[PDB]
Each structure stands twice: as C-alpha cells, then as structure tokens.
PDB file of N, CA and C and ligand atoms in Angstrom:
ATOM      1  N   UNK A  14       0.847  -1.211   0.000  1.00 30.02           N
ATOM      2  CA  UNK A  14       0.000   0.000   0.000  1.00 30.02           C
ATOM      3  C   UNK A  14       0.873   1.249   0.000  1.00 30.02           C
ATOM      4  N   UNK A  15       0.236   2.415  -0.008  1.00 27.12           N
ATOM      5  CA  UNK A  15       0.948   3.686  -0.084  1.00 27.12           C
ATOM      6  C   UNK A  15       0.517   4.625   1.034  1.00 27.12           C
ATOM      7  N   UNK A  16      -0.744   4.526   1.439  1.00 26.09           N
ATOM      8  CA  UNK A  16      -1.244   5.325   2.546  1.00 26.09           C
ATOM      9  C   UNK A  16      -1.028   4.597   3.862  1.00 26.09           C
ATOM     10  N   UNK A  17      -0.605   5.339   4.875  1.00 25.56           N
ATOM     11  CA  UNK A  17      -0.300   4.743   6.154  1.00 25.56           C
ATOM     12  C   UNK A  17      -1.371   5.015   7.190  1.00 25.56           C
ATOM     13  N   UNK A  18      -1.511   4.095   8.127  1.00 22.11           N
ATOM     14  CA  UNK A  18      -2.472   4.220   9.210  1.00 22.11           C
ATOM     15  C   UNK A  18      -1.908   3.553  10.451  1.00 22.11           C
ATOM     16  N   UNK A  19      -1.463   4.364  11.395  1.00 18.31           N
ATOM     17  CA  UNK A  19      -0.805   3.863  12.586  1.00 18.31           C
ATOM     18  C   UNK A  19      -1.633   4.220  13.823  1.00 18.31           C
ATOM     19  N   UNK A  20      -1.463   3.470  14.896  1.00 21.08           N
ATOM     20  CA  UNK A  20      -2.139   3.761  16.147  1.00 21.08           C
ATOM     21  C   UNK A  20      -1.101   3.966  17.250  1.00 21.08           C
ATOM     22  N   UNK A  21      -0.981   5.197  17.741  1.00 18.03           N
ATOM     23  CA  UNK A  21      -0.028   5.501  18.810  1.00 18.03           C
ATOM     24  C   UNK A  21      -0.782   5.857  20.081  1.00 18.03           C
ATOM     25  N   UNK A  22      -0.210   5.556  21.231  1.00 14.59           N
ATOM     26  CA  UNK A  22      -0.856   5.871  22.500  1.00 14.59           C
ATOM     27  C   UNK A  22      -0.189   7.081  23.152  1.00 14.59           C
ATOM     28  N   UNK A  23      -0.829   7.625  24.185  1.00 15.12           N
ATOM     29  CA  UNK A  23      -0.343   8.837  24.833  1.00 15.12           C
ATOM     30  C   UNK A  23       1.002   8.669  25.527  1.00 15.12           C
ATOM     31  N   UNK A  24       1.498   7.439  25.592  1.00 14.82           N
ATOM     32  CA  UNK A  24       2.820   7.184  26.150  1.00 14.82           C
ATOM     33  C   UNK A  24       3.869   7.281  25.054  1.00 14.82           C
ATOM     34  N   UNK A  25       3.575   6.659  23.922  1.00 15.16           N
ATOM     35  CA  UNK A  25       4.497   6.664  22.805  1.00 15.16           C
ATOM     36  C   UNK A  25       4.658   5.291  22.187  1.00 15.16           C
ATOM     37  N   UNK A  26       3.775   4.375  22.560  1.00 15.10           N
ATOM     38  CA  UNK A  26       3.835   3.006  22.066  1.00 15.10           C
ATOM     39  C   UNK A  26       3.033   2.876  20.791  1.00 15.10           C
ATOM     40  N   UNK A  27       3.458   1.967  19.935  1.00 17.42           N
ATOM     41  CA  UNK A  27       2.732   1.678  18.720  1.00 17.42           C
ATOM     42  C   UNK A  27       1.788   0.503  18.951  1.00 17.42           C
ATOM     43  N   UNK A  28       0.639   0.548  18.301  1.00 15.51           N
ATOM     44  CA  UNK A  28      -0.336  -0.518  18.380  1.00 15.51           C
ATOM     45  C   UNK A  28      -0.349  -1.309  17.085  1.00 15.51           C
ATOM     46  N   UNK A  29      -0.817  -0.658  16.032  1.00 13.83           N
ATOM     47  CA  UNK A  29      -0.974  -1.303  14.745  1.00 13.83           C
ATOM     48  C   UNK A  29      -0.422  -0.424  13.634  1.00 13.83           C
ATOM     49  N   UNK A  30       0.357  -1.032  12.758  1.00 11.39           N
ATOM     50  CA  UNK A  30       0.814  -0.376  11.538  1.00 11.39           C
ATOM     51  C   UNK A  30      -0.114  -0.714  10.376  1.00 11.39           C
ATOM     52  N   UNK A  31       0.243  -0.237   9.195  1.00 12.80           N
ATOM     53  CA  UNK A  31      -0.503  -0.528   7.981  1.00 12.80           C
ATOM     54  C   UNK A  31       0.413  -1.272   7.014  1.00 12.80           C
ATOM     55  N   UNK A  32      -0.163  -1.871   5.983  1.00 12.01           N
ATOM     56  CA  UNK A  32       0.602  -2.636   5.004  1.00 12.01           C
ATOM     57  C   UNK A  32       1.338  -1.715   4.029  1.00 12.01           C
ATOM     58  N   UNK A  33       1.507  -0.461   4.421  1.00  8.98           N
ATOM     59  CA  UNK A  33       2.330   0.472   3.674  1.00  8.98           C
ATOM     60  C   UNK A  33       3.753   0.479   4.223  1.00  8.98           C
ATOM     61  N   UNK A  34       3.877   0.605   5.547  1.00  6.99           N
ATOM     62  CA  UNK A  34       5.188   0.661   6.191  1.00  6.99           C
ATOM     63  C   UNK A  34       5.871  -0.700   6.105  1.00  6.99           C
ATOM     64  N   UNK A  35       5.067  -1.750   6.068  1.00 10.34           N
ATOM     65  CA  UNK A  35       5.606  -3.091   5.981  1.00 10.34           C
ATOM     66  C   UNK A  35       5.824  -3.530   4.552  1.00 10.34           C
ATOM     67  N   UNK A  36       5.392  -2.705   3.613  1.00  8.81           N
ATOM     68  CA  UNK A  36       5.483  -3.048   2.201  1.00  8.81           C
ATOM     69  C   UNK A  36       6.869  -2.725   1.657  1.00  8.81           C
ATOM     70  N   UNK A  37       7.249  -1.455   1.730  1.00  9.93           N
ATOM     71  CA  UNK A  37       8.538  -1.016   1.231  1.00  9.93           C
ATOM     72  C   UNK A  37       9.597  -0.982   2.336  1.00  9.93           C
ATOM     73  N   UNK A  38       9.252  -0.417   3.490  1.00  6.90           N
ATOM     74  CA  UNK A  38      10.190  -0.307   4.595  1.00  6.90           C
ATOM     75  C   UNK A  38      10.461  -1.677   5.206  1.00  6.90           C
ATOM     76  N   UNK A  39       9.393  -2.357   5.597  1.00  5.92           N
ATOM     77  CA  UNK A  39       9.525  -3.680   6.165  1.00  5.92           C
ATOM     78  C   UNK A  39       9.197  -3.709   7.641  1.00  5.92           C
ATOM     79  N   UNK A  40       8.172  -2.966   8.034  1.00  4.16           N
ATOM     80  CA  UNK A  40       7.704  -2.981   9.413  1.00  4.16           C
ATOM     81  C   UNK A  40       6.263  -3.466   9.457  1.00  4.16           C
ATOM     82  N   UNK A  41       6.088  -4.746   9.761  1.00  3.35           N
ATOM     83  CA  UNK A  41       4.760  -5.356   9.803  1.00  3.35           C
ATOM     84  C   UNK A  41       3.913  -4.722  10.905  1.00  3.35           C
ATOM     85  N   UNK A  42       2.580  -4.734  10.739  1.00  3.85           N
ATOM     86  CA  UNK A  42       1.639  -4.107  11.684  1.00  3.85           C
ATOM     87  C   UNK A  42       1.748  -4.647  13.111  1.00  3.85           C
ATOM     88  N   UNK A  43       2.349  -5.819  13.262  1.00  3.28           N
ATOM     89  CA  UNK A  43       2.439  -6.468  14.564  1.00  3.28           C
ATOM     90  C   UNK A  43       3.859  -6.420  15.125  1.00  3.28           C
ATOM     91  N   UNK A  44       4.762  -5.738  14.432  1.00  3.62           N
ATOM     92  CA  UNK A  44       6.163  -5.699  14.851  1.00  3.62           C
ATOM     93  C   UNK A  44       6.432  -4.527  15.787  1.00  3.62           C
ATOM     94  N   UNK A  45       5.455  -3.645  15.918  1.00  2.00           N
ATOM     95  CA  UNK A  45       5.646  -2.393  16.638  1.00  2.00           C
ATOM     96  C   UNK A  45       4.854  -2.328  17.938  1.00  2.00           C
ATOM     97  N   UNK A  46       4.551  -3.471  18.521  1.00  2.00           N
ATOM     98  CA  UNK A  46       3.731  -3.487  19.722  1.00  2.00           C
ATOM     99  C   UNK A  46       4.608  -3.390  20.962  1.00  2.00           C
ATOM    100  N   UNK A  47       4.311  -2.422  21.826  1.00  2.00           N
ATOM    101  CA  UNK A  47       5.141  -2.203  22.988  1.00  2.00           C
ATOM    102  C   UNK A  47       6.369  -1.416  22.629  1.00  2.00           C
ATOM    103  N   UNK A  48       6.384  -0.934  21.405  1.00  2.00           N
ATOM    104  CA  UNK A  48       7.532  -0.254  20.872  1.00  2.00           C
ATOM    105  C   UNK A  48       7.275   1.235  20.780  1.00  2.00           C
ATOM    106  N   UNK A  49       8.275   2.019  21.134  1.00  2.00           N
ATOM    107  CA  UNK A  49       8.165   3.466  21.056  1.00  2.00           C
ATOM    108  C   UNK A  49       8.389   3.923  19.624  1.00  2.00           C
ATOM    109  N   UNK A  50       7.345   4.472  19.021  1.00  2.00           N
ATOM    110  CA  UNK A  50       7.395   4.928  17.632  1.00  2.00           C
ATOM    111  C   UNK A  50       8.515   5.931  17.417  1.00  2.00           C
ATOM    112  N   UNK A  51       8.641   6.850  18.354  1.00  2.00           N
ATOM    113  CA  UNK A  51       9.457   8.037  18.170  1.00  2.00           C
ATOM    114  C   UNK A  51      10.939   7.763  18.405  1.00  2.00           C
ATOM    115  N   UNK A  52      11.262   6.562  18.857  1.00  2.00           N
ATOM    116  CA  UNK A  52      12.642   6.231  19.181  1.00  2.00           C
ATOM    117  C   UNK A  52      13.059   4.875  18.634  1.00  2.00           C
ATOM    118  N   UNK A  53      12.217   3.868  18.808  1.00  2.00           N
ATOM    119  CA  UNK A  53      12.630   2.504  18.508  1.00  2.00           C
ATOM    120  C   UNK A  53      12.301   2.114  17.071  1.00  2.00           C
ATOM    121  N   UNK A  54      11.321   2.778  16.457  1.00  2.00           N
ATOM    122  CA  UNK A  54      10.945   2.429  15.087  1.00  2.00           C
ATOM    123  C   UNK A  54      10.939   3.669  14.187  1.00  2.00           C
ATOM    124  N   UNK A  55      11.535   4.755  14.686  1.00  2.00           N
ATOM    125  CA  UNK A  55      11.608   6.026  13.955  1.00  2.00           C
ATOM    126  C   UNK A  55      12.198   7.119  14.839  1.00  2.00           C
ATOM    127  N   UNK A  56      13.516   7.097  15.073  1.00  2.00           N
ATOM    128  CA  UNK A  56      14.182   8.035  15.985  1.00  2.00           C
ATOM    129  C   UNK A  56      14.379   9.431  15.394  1.00  2.00           C
ATOM    130  N   UNK A  57      13.710   9.729  14.287  1.00  2.00           N
ATOM    131  CA  UNK A  57      13.788  11.067  13.722  1.00  2.00           C
ATOM    132  C   UNK A  57      12.588  11.901  14.168  1.00  2.00           C
ATOM    133  N   UNK A  58      11.661  11.248  14.863  1.00  2.00           N
ATOM    134  CA  UNK A  58      10.305  11.759  14.975  1.00  2.00           C
ATOM    135  C   UNK A  58      10.076  12.461  16.312  1.00  2.00           C
ATOM    136  N   UNK A  59      10.800  12.042  17.360  1.00  2.00           N
ATOM    137  CA  UNK A  59      10.611  12.637  18.682  1.00  2.00           C
ATOM    138  C   UNK A  59      11.250  14.029  18.758  1.00  2.00           C
ATOM    139  N   UNK A  60      10.539  14.991  18.196  1.00  2.00           N
ATOM    140  CA  UNK A  60      10.971  16.378  18.153  1.00  2.00           C
ATOM    141  C   UNK A  60       9.731  17.280  18.089  1.00  2.00           C
ATOM    142  N   UNK A  61       9.885  18.611  18.259  1.00  2.00           N
ATOM    143  CA  UNK A  61       8.746  19.543  18.389  1.00  2.00           C
ATOM    144  C   UNK A  61       7.819  19.608  17.164  1.00  2.00           C
ATOM    145  N   UNK A  62       8.254  19.084  16.024  1.00  2.00           N
ATOM    146  CA  UNK A  62       7.466  19.206  14.797  1.00  2.00           C
ATOM    147  C   UNK A  62       6.558  17.991  14.590  1.00  2.00           C
ATOM    148  N   UNK A  63       7.018  16.817  14.993  1.00  2.00           N
ATOM    149  CA  UNK A  63       6.211  15.612  14.886  1.00  2.00           C
ATOM    150  C   UNK A  63       5.703  15.187  16.258  1.00  2.00           C
ATOM    151  N   UNK A  64       6.619  14.726  17.101  1.00  2.00           N
ATOM    152  CA  UNK A  64       6.274  14.267  18.442  1.00  2.00           C
ATOM    153  C   UNK A  64       5.649  15.393  19.254  1.00  2.00           C
ATOM    154  N   UNK A  65       6.208  16.590  19.118  1.00  2.00           N
ATOM    155  CA  UNK A  65       5.700  17.742  19.835  1.00  2.00           C
ATOM    156  C   UNK A  65       4.236  17.999  19.549  1.00  2.00           C
ATOM    157  N   UNK A  66       3.872  18.016  18.270  1.00  2.36           N
ATOM    158  CA  UNK A  66       2.497  18.293  17.869  1.00  2.36           C
ATOM    159  C   UNK A  66       1.573  17.161  18.308  1.00  2.36           C
ATOM    160  N   UNK A  67       2.081  15.935  18.230  1.00  2.00           N
ATOM    161  CA  UNK A  67       1.363  14.765  18.730  1.00  2.00           C
ATOM    162  C   UNK A  67       1.042  14.934  20.212  1.00  2.00           C
ATOM    163  N   UNK A  68       1.997  15.468  20.949  1.00  2.00           N
ATOM    164  CA  UNK A  68       1.868  15.609  22.390  1.00  2.00           C
ATOM    165  C   UNK A  68       0.993  16.793  22.777  1.00  2.00           C
ATOM    166  N   UNK A  69       0.790  17.730  21.856  1.00  2.00           N
ATOM    167  CA  UNK A  69       0.034  18.936  22.177  1.00  2.00           C
ATOM    168  C   UNK A  69      -1.423  18.603  22.474  1.00  2.00           C
ATOM    169  N   UNK A  70      -1.986  17.679  21.708  1.00  2.00           N
ATOM    170  CA  UNK A  70      -3.350  17.253  21.956  1.00  2.00           C
ATOM    171  C   UNK A  70      -3.456  16.458  23.239  1.00  2.00           C
ATOM    172  N   UNK A  71      -2.484  15.576  23.447  1.00  2.00           N
ATOM    173  CA  UNK A  71      -2.392  14.782  24.669  1.00  2.00           C
ATOM    174  C   UNK A  71      -2.326  15.688  25.898  1.00  2.00           C
ATOM    175  N   UNK A  72      -1.402  16.646  25.862  1.00  2.00           N
ATOM    176  CA  UNK A  72      -1.198  17.577  26.966  1.00  2.00           C
ATOM    177  C   UNK A  72      -2.446  18.410  27.240  1.00  2.00           C
ATOM    178  N   UNK A  73      -3.259  18.604  26.213  1.00  2.00           N
ATOM    179  CA  UNK A  73      -4.496  19.350  26.359  1.00  2.00           C
ATOM    180  C   UNK A  73      -5.607  18.433  26.878  1.00  2.00           C
ATOM    181  N   UNK A  74      -6.164  17.625  25.989  1.00  2.00           N
ATOM    182  CA  UNK A  74      -7.215  16.708  26.369  1.00  2.00           C
ATOM    183  C   UNK A  74      -7.466  15.687  25.289  1.00  2.00           C
ATOM    184  N   UNK A  75      -8.000  16.158  24.176  1.00  2.00           N
ATOM    185  CA  UNK A  75      -8.230  15.317  23.015  1.00  2.00           C
ATOM    186  C   UNK A  75      -7.224  15.664  21.930  1.00  2.00           C
ATOM    187  N   UNK A  76      -6.923  14.704  21.073  1.00  2.00           N
ATOM    188  CA  UNK A  76      -5.910  14.893  20.060  1.00  2.00           C
ATOM    189  C   UNK A  76      -6.528  14.767  18.683  1.00  2.00           C
ATOM    190  N   UNK A  77      -6.315  15.775  17.860  1.00  2.00           N
ATOM    191  CA  UNK A  77      -6.789  15.767  16.489  1.00  2.00           C
ATOM    192  C   UNK A  77      -6.113  16.880  15.705  1.00  2.00           C
ATOM    193  N   UNK A  78      -5.030  16.515  15.049  1.00  2.00           N
ATOM    194  CA  UNK A  78      -4.196  17.472  14.352  1.00  2.00           C
ATOM    195  C   UNK A  78      -3.741  16.885  13.018  1.00  2.00           C
ATOM    196  N   UNK A  79      -3.454  17.746  12.062  1.00  2.00           N
ATOM    197  CA  UNK A  79      -2.898  17.316  10.791  1.00  2.00           C
ATOM    198  C   UNK A  79      -1.788  18.258  10.359  1.00  2.00           C
ATOM    199  N   UNK A  80      -0.556  17.782  10.416  1.00  2.00           N
ATOM    200  CA  UNK A  80       0.582  18.589   9.980  1.00  2.00           C
ATOM    201  C   UNK A  80       1.377  17.864   8.902  1.00  2.00           C
ATOM    202  N   UNK A  81       2.273  18.578   8.238  1.00  2.00           N
ATOM    203  CA  UNK A  81       3.099  17.986   7.195  1.00  2.00           C
ATOM    204  C   UNK A  81       4.502  17.727   7.737  1.00  2.00           C
ATOM    205  N   UNK A  82       5.011  16.529   7.483  1.00  2.00           N
ATOM    206  CA  UNK A  82       6.281  16.097   8.047  1.00  2.00           C
ATOM    207  C   UNK A  82       7.046  15.229   7.049  1.00  2.00           C
ATOM    208  N   UNK A  83       8.370  15.260   7.136  1.00  2.00           N
ATOM    209  CA  UNK A  83       9.211  14.477   6.250  1.00  2.00           C
ATOM    210  C   UNK A  83       9.790  13.265   6.982  1.00  2.00           C
ATOM    211  N   UNK A  84       9.869  12.135   6.290  1.00  2.00           N
ATOM    212  CA  UNK A  84      10.486  10.934   6.840  1.00  2.00           C
ATOM    213  C   UNK A  84      11.858  10.729   6.220  1.00  2.00           C
ATOM    214  N   UNK A  85      12.872  10.707   7.069  1.00  2.00           N
ATOM    215  CA  UNK A  85      14.247  10.527   6.635  1.00  2.00           C
ATOM    216  C   UNK A  85      14.999   9.689   7.660  1.00  2.00           C
ATOM    217  N   UNK A  86      16.330   9.816   7.684  1.00  2.00           N
ATOM    218  CA  UNK A  86      17.190   9.108   8.648  1.00  2.00           C
ATOM    219  C   UNK A  86      17.311   7.616   8.313  1.00  2.00           C
ATOM    220  N   UNK A  87      16.319   7.092   7.619  1.00  2.00           N
ATOM    221  CA  UNK A  87      16.312   5.699   7.191  1.00  2.00           C
ATOM    222  C   UNK A  87      15.359   5.538   6.017  1.00  2.00           C
ATOM    223  N   UNK A  88      14.248   6.256   6.082  1.00  2.00           N
ATOM    224  CA  UNK A  88      13.348   6.380   4.950  1.00  2.00           C
ATOM    225  C   UNK A  88      13.922   7.394   3.976  1.00  2.00           C
ATOM    226  N   UNK A  89      13.749   7.156   2.688  1.00  2.00           N
ATOM    227  CA  UNK A  89      14.107   8.150   1.703  1.00  2.00           C
ATOM    228  C   UNK A  89      13.162   9.333   1.848  1.00  2.00           C
ATOM    229  N   UNK A  90      13.602  10.560   1.500  1.00  2.00           N
ATOM    230  CA  UNK A  90      12.838  11.788   1.762  1.00  2.00           C
ATOM    231  C   UNK A  90      11.376  11.710   1.334  1.00  2.00           C
ATOM    232  N   UNK A  91      10.544  11.217   2.238  1.00  2.00           N
ATOM    233  CA  UNK A  91       9.124  11.124   1.997  1.00  2.00           C
ATOM    234  C   UNK A  91       8.392  12.265   2.687  1.00  2.00           C
ATOM    235  N   UNK A  92       7.541  12.952   1.941  1.00  2.00           N
ATOM    236  CA  UNK A  92       6.753  14.037   2.491  1.00  2.00           C
ATOM    237  C   UNK A  92       5.328  13.565   2.713  1.00  2.00           C
ATOM    238  N   UNK A  93       4.928  13.519   3.970  1.00  2.00           N
ATOM    239  CA  UNK A  93       3.606  13.040   4.328  1.00  2.00           C
ATOM    240  C   UNK A  93       2.875  14.048   5.194  1.00  2.00           C
ATOM    241  N   UNK A  94       1.582  13.845   5.330  1.00  2.00           N
ATOM    242  CA  UNK A  94       0.778  14.631   6.227  1.00  2.00           C
ATOM    243  C   UNK A  94       0.250  13.727   7.313  1.00  2.00           C
ATOM    244  N   UNK A  95       0.462  14.137   8.540  1.00  2.00           N
ATOM    245  CA  UNK A  95       0.193  13.317   9.684  1.00  2.00           C
ATOM    246  C   UNK A  95      -1.081  13.796  10.354  1.00  2.00           C
ATOM    247  N   UNK A  96      -2.152  13.051  10.152  1.00  2.00           N
ATOM    248  CA  UNK A  96      -3.421  13.380  10.764  1.00  2.00           C
ATOM    249  C   UNK A  96      -3.667  12.447  11.931  1.00  2.00           C
ATOM    250  N   UNK A  97      -3.486  12.973  13.123  1.00  2.00           N
ATOM    251  CA  UNK A  97      -3.659  12.189  14.332  1.00  2.00           C
ATOM    252  C   UNK A  97      -4.982  12.549  14.997  1.00  2.00           C
ATOM    253  N   UNK A  98      -5.643  11.557  15.583  1.00  2.00           N
ATOM    254  CA  UNK A  98      -6.959  11.747  16.182  1.00  2.00           C
ATOM    255  C   UNK A  98      -7.174  10.709  17.274  1.00  2.00           C
ATOM    256  N   UNK A  99      -8.015  11.010  18.246  1.00  2.00           N
ATOM    257  CA  UNK A  99      -8.147  10.164  19.427  1.00  2.00           C
ATOM    258  C   UNK A  99      -9.001   8.931  19.141  1.00  2.00           C
ATOM    259  N   UNK A 100      -8.591   7.799  19.696  1.00  2.00           N
ATOM    260  CA  UNK A 100      -9.323   6.552  19.546  1.00  2.00           C
ATOM    261  C   UNK A 100      -9.898   6.111  20.886  1.00  2.00           C
ATOM    262  N   UNK A 101     -10.772   5.115  20.856  1.00  2.00           N
ATOM    263  CA  UNK A 101     -11.341   4.569  22.079  1.00  2.00           C
ATOM    264  C   UNK A 101     -11.454   3.043  22.014  1.00  2.00           C
ATOM    265  N   UNK A 102     -11.152   2.469  20.848  1.00  2.00           N
ATOM    266  CA  UNK A 102     -11.029   1.018  20.720  1.00  2.00           C
ATOM    267  C   UNK A 102      -9.904   0.530  21.621  1.00  2.00           C
ATOM    268  N   UNK A 103      -8.851   1.322  21.644  1.00  2.00           N
ATOM    269  CA  UNK A 103      -7.775   1.140  22.581  1.00  2.00           C
ATOM    270  C   UNK A 103      -7.307   2.492  23.048  1.00  2.00           C
ATOM    271  N   UNK A 104      -6.789   2.573  24.263  1.00  2.00           N
ATOM    272  CA  UNK A 104      -6.336   3.850  24.813  1.00  2.00           C
ATOM    273  C   UNK A 104      -5.167   4.386  23.995  1.00  2.00           C
ATOM    274  N   UNK A 105      -5.495   5.164  22.967  1.00  2.00           N
ATOM    275  CA  UNK A 105      -4.517   5.629  22.001  1.00  2.00           C
ATOM    276  C   UNK A 105      -5.175   6.559  20.980  1.00  2.00           C
ATOM    277  N   UNK A 106      -4.443   6.891  19.925  1.00  2.00           N
ATOM    278  CA  UNK A 106      -4.927   7.750  18.870  1.00  2.00           C
ATOM    279  C   UNK A 106      -4.683   7.064  17.534  1.00  2.00           C
ATOM    280  N   UNK A 107      -5.421   7.461  16.519  1.00  2.00           N
ATOM    281  CA  UNK A 107      -5.191   6.969  15.178  1.00  2.00           C
ATOM    282  C   UNK A 107      -4.461   8.031  14.384  1.00  2.00           C
ATOM    283  N   UNK A 108      -3.205   7.768  14.097  1.00  2.00           N
ATOM    284  CA  UNK A 108      -2.414   8.689  13.319  1.00  2.00           C
ATOM    285  C   UNK A 108      -2.278   8.195  11.874  1.00  2.00           C
ATOM    286  N   UNK A 109      -2.738   9.019  10.946  1.00  2.00           N
ATOM    287  CA  UNK A 109      -2.778   8.647   9.543  1.00  2.00           C
ATOM    288  C   UNK A 109      -1.659   9.318   8.771  1.00  2.00           C
ATOM    289  N   UNK A 110      -1.025   8.538   7.912  1.00  2.00           N
ATOM    290  CA  UNK A 110       0.077   9.013   7.093  1.00  2.00           C
ATOM    291  C   UNK A 110      -0.394   9.225   5.655  1.00  2.00           C
ATOM    292  N   UNK A 111      -0.518  10.482   5.259  1.00  2.00           N
ATOM    293  CA  UNK A 111      -0.954  10.816   3.913  1.00  2.00           C
ATOM    294  C   UNK A 111       0.235  11.261   3.070  1.00  2.00           C
ATOM    295  N   UNK A 112       0.694  10.387   2.183  1.00  2.00           N
ATOM    296  CA  UNK A 112       1.829  10.699   1.325  1.00  2.00           C
ATOM    297  C   UNK A 112       1.362  11.485   0.107  1.00  2.00           C
ATOM    298  N   UNK A 113       1.986  12.628  -0.129  1.00  2.00           N
ATOM    299  CA  UNK A 113       1.621  13.470  -1.254  1.00  2.00           C
ATOM    300  C   UNK A 113       2.480  13.165  -2.482  1.00  2.00           C
TER     301      UNK A 113
HETATM  302  C1  HC4 B   1      12.534   8.744  11.251  1.00  2.00           C
HETATM  303  O1  HC4 B   1      13.394   8.144  11.897  1.00  2.00           O
HETATM  304  C2  HC4 B   1      11.517   8.031  10.363  1.00  2.00           C
HETATM  305  C3  HC4 B   1      11.536   6.720  10.268  1.00  2.00           C
HETATM  306  C4  HC4 B   1      10.617   5.937   9.471  1.00  2.00           C
HETATM  307  C5  HC4 B   1       9.623   6.537   8.710  1.00  2.00           C
HETATM  308  C6  HC4 B   1       8.749   5.779   7.949  1.00  2.00           C
HETATM  309  C7  HC4 B   1       8.866   4.408   7.942  1.00  2.00           C
HETATM  310  O2  HC4 B   1       8.008   3.646   7.182  1.00  2.00           O
HETATM  311  C8  HC4 B   1       9.841   3.791   8.685  1.00  2.00           C
HETATM  312  C9  HC4 B   1      10.711   4.551   9.444  1.00  2.00           C
END
C-alpha cells in the first residue's frame, strides 16, 4: 500500500501499523507493539514538529491534528501529512500518514 495508518498511545507506544510501512520499509503491523514509535521504530520523529504536535493534543485533552512532516534518517525523503486523532477502541490515537 501507499497510505499509512498507525495507532499511537499517549505514552508513545505503537499498536498497529498498515501494510504500507511493511510493504517497502519492512515494518509489519504487529512488529511495533510495545515499541516506542518516536525512538525505537523512527528516531527522527521525537521532536517539536512531529512528536511535539502529537503531544500537544495529549497535553491538552483530546488529540486531532494534521501537519506535514518528512520521513528521513532511514526512509528516503518522503513528504507526508500526519493526521492524528483520538481513539477509544484502545487507549490511544489513530495517526494517519498521507503521502503526497
Ligand atoms: C525517522 O526516523 C523516520 C523513520 C521511518 C519513517 C517511515 C517508515 O516507514 C519507517 C521509518
């Protein structure tokens, strides 16, 4: 696939990936459980532009934001839009990766 759909929790753990990250990169939807997205499966991300914005909704109350971010450090320069929103199926949020 090409569009991404990830589930991150207010701590920083990954729940479920999509068959996009596991398609080209090689991260299956079940390989990221108990894993910190921002450090263990993407150490470029824990910063004020990605992780920071993710945390802004958490720090407030509900999370629902869409910003544009680049994936590098291991991914080739991919420009995506990160639409994160709160979930209740599991204590976490649904963060969507929209590649332009
Ligand atoms: C920053 O370290 C980004 C890492 C990354 C982005 C996208 C992927 O599919 C895999 C790793």
